[PDB]
């Protein structure tokens, strides 16, 4: 029953090959709903979910203008960061920003976040109280000083506690069919010999939504986490997710092993067995 709205922004410099590439996407929970791509022909914020399509021209004009303004600020940032870190003109670097809000089952504000990274590492982030900053290194302290003097946190908090929550509610209502659903995983296990003395047991979960899921193997009830290969939860492309976990076991001991599946769409966690 819990929900989130998140926007993700990536800018990558390509010195001597034009302006930095900028890509923005927005999600409600695990469902994408908007994008903008600086390299694309339209130069517009575009719909990526059916239920955002009904937003009118003021929404699309306004979101296009704001996202282009985010893109320009990251263009400035790439220059600034290269000065803060004394980096050379020619190498490619990456700025990432993510922000948004979480609400619970009752749709009231739970938490807010606004985080920045440079070259794949934490740079600066709003703390939980939305009033202060965590700066990860000395260059990010320079940004903290500038953002404190400019009262950046207060303006962000007003968004994250207010507007962000208000628009997440609206999307959850307009997209109710898509966003307020739970699709429980279809589960099974497969068994294949790898030789005459060992077998792979692979526990599968298919067609589920949302993406959060836990799959674990037990041997006589003991978790086998060091011996489990757990793949990243992956999209099926139809709005649902898949995942698997596998162990390689001595032939004959299958009945000692069980797979355990937890997902919010299940009335109870499932235990799958070889007997």
């Amino acid at each position: 029953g819990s929900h989130s709205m998140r926007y993700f922004f990536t800018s990558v410099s390509r010195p001597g090959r034009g302006e930095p590439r900028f890509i923005a996407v927005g999600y409600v929970d695990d469902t994408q709903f908007v994008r903008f791509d600086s390299d694309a022909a339209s130069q517009r914020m575009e719909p990526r979910a059916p239920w955002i399509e009904q937003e009118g021209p003021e929404y699309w004009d306004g979101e296009t203008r704001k996202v282009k303004a985010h893109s320009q600020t990251h263009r400035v940032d790439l220059g600034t960061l290269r000065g803060y870190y004394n980096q050379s003109e020619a190498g490619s670097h990456t700025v990432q920003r993510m922000y948004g809000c979480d609400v619970g089952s009752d749709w009231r504000f739970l938490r807010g976040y606004h985080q920045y990274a440079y070259d794949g590492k934490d740079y600066i982030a709003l703390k939980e109280d939305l009033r202060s900053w965590t700066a990860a290194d000395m260059a990010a302290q320079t940004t903290k000083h500038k953002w404190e003097a400019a009262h950046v946190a207060e303006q962000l908090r007003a968004y994250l506690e207010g507007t962000c929550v208000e628009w997440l509610r609206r999307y959850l209502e307009n997209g109710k069919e898509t966003l307020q659903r739970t699709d429980a995983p279809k589960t099974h296990m497969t068994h294949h010999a790898v030789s005459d003395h060992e077998a792979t047991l692979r526990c599968w979960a298919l067609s589920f939504y949302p993406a959060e899921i836990t799959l674990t193997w037990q041997r006589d009830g003991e978790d086998q986490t060091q011996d489990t290969e757990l793949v990243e939860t992956r999209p099926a492309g139809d709005g649902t997710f898949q995942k698997w976990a596998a162990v390689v076991v001595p032939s004959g001991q299958e009945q000692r092993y069980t797979c355990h599946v937890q997902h919010e769409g299940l009335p109870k966690p499932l235990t799958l067995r070889w007997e």
Partner: peptide
Amino acid sequence: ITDQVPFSV
């Protein structure tokens, strides 16, 4: 919807 223009670093 997005927030307003971010302040530069």
